[PDB]
């Protein structure tokens, strides 16, 4: 299912929901 | 005495606005193409006017 | 819809088959006026 050849984002792009964590997969807090 | 207004010294220094030649012109009629109450609302329709 | 997996890339092709009416009309010498339409998926609204 590859998406080679493939535009960038064939999708409609939903709200960055405002949360906390829905933003990325880092490390973090003190 | 019957090509020159009566003046009280030649060569007046400020000709008055009314012993000067104004020029009134007719009154410019104009053709209003259009209506733009129901160019408006067809637009709103939908349609898409266009052209001349 | 569904479609059998091709590995070459592939997008689809969907139509509305939708009215496209035109009139066009000429009220003096050299002038055209025209007016386009298309009912469910009109071209233009009341925000242009």
Excluded: C
């Excluded at chain 1, 405002?18 to 933003?23: E, H, K, S």
Aim: proline share 10%; hydrophobic share 40%; aromatic share 10%.
């Amino acid at each position: 299912v590859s998406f080679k050849g493939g535009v960038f984002s064939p999708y409609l792009t939903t709200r960055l929901p405002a949360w906390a964590g829905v933003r990325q997969n880092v490390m973090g807090s003190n | 005495a019957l090509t020159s207004t009566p003046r009280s010294q030649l060569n007046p220094p400020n000709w008055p606005a009314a012993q000067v030649y104004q020029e009134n012109p007719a009154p410019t009629t104009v053709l209003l193409p259009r209506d733009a109450e129901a160019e408006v609302q067809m637009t709103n329709s939908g349609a898409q006017l266009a052209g001349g | 819809f569904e479609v059998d997996p091709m590995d070459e890339p592939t997008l689809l092709y969907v139509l509305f088959e939708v009215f496209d009416v035109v009139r066009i009309h000429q009220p003096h010498r050299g002038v055209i006026e025209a007016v386009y339409l298309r009912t469910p998926f009109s071209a233009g609204n009341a925000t242009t």
